[PDB]
Every structure is written in structure tokens, then in C-alpha cells.
Amino acid sequence: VPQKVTIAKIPRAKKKYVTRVCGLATFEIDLKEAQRFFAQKFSCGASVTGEDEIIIQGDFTDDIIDVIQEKWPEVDDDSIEDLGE
Ligand SMILES: [Hg+2]
Ligand SMILES: [Hg+2]
């Protein structure tokens, strides 16, 4: 009986997403330090991508609300909204 090892990758149906945060600068949060905070808390790249918006290179839509409010308590529950897709 032969003696061999094979490795391969097989796509899943689950998509890779990107997480977009808009409105931080309206609470007079600085988008640059917001970007770097997100980068480090999530261990994942991020960039300011609009004039008030930051894009994080993963799906963090579960935590992202609580994380935002922990770090910036100004942001009350009636002013941060999870859109969807
Ligand atoms: Hg936006
Ligand atoms: Hg990542």
C-alpha cells in the first residue's frame, strides 16, 4: 500500500466580509486613532476609507457595537445602528 500525503483547500459557502464603521467623527472621535484602536483590538488591518468612515478587514459585526461603546461611552444605544448587508 503506497505512502503519500496530500494537502488541498476546499471552498466553503461562507463569505469573507469586511466591517465598515461610519459616524465616529460626528461624536468628535478622531478617525485616525479610531482606526488604530480597531486595528489593534481586532488584530486586523484597517484604513480610513471615506471622510467619516473606517473599514476593518474582517467580520466583527457581533462585537463591534459593544467594543465601540466600551471604548467611547458617548455612543449611546440609540445612535449606533447595525444595518446588515
Ligand atoms: Hg459611510
Ligand atoms: Hg483580519
Domain boundaries, the chain: 19-76
* Ligand 1 midpoint to CA 43 (Å): 22
* Ligand 2 midpoint to CA 48 (Å): 16
Experimental method, per PDB record = X-ray
* Ligand 1 midpoint to CA 20 (Å): 7
Q: How many CB atoms lie within 10 A of CB 24?
A: 24
Contact at 8 Å (CB) between 75 and 21? no
Tell me the HSE value of 45 on the side-chain side, using a 13 A CA sphere.
Answer: 4
Contact at 8 Å (CB) between 45 and 61? no
Nearest bound ligand to the CA of residue 49 = 1
| Region label for 43, one of left (φ > 0), alpha (ψ between -120 and 50) or beta (otherwise) | left
Given in angstroms, what resolution was this structure solved at? 2.2
Question: Distance (Å, rounded) from C-alpha 21 to C-alpha 47?
Answer: 11
Contact at 8 Å (CB) between 40 and 34? no
Contact at 8 Å (CB) between 24 and 54? yes
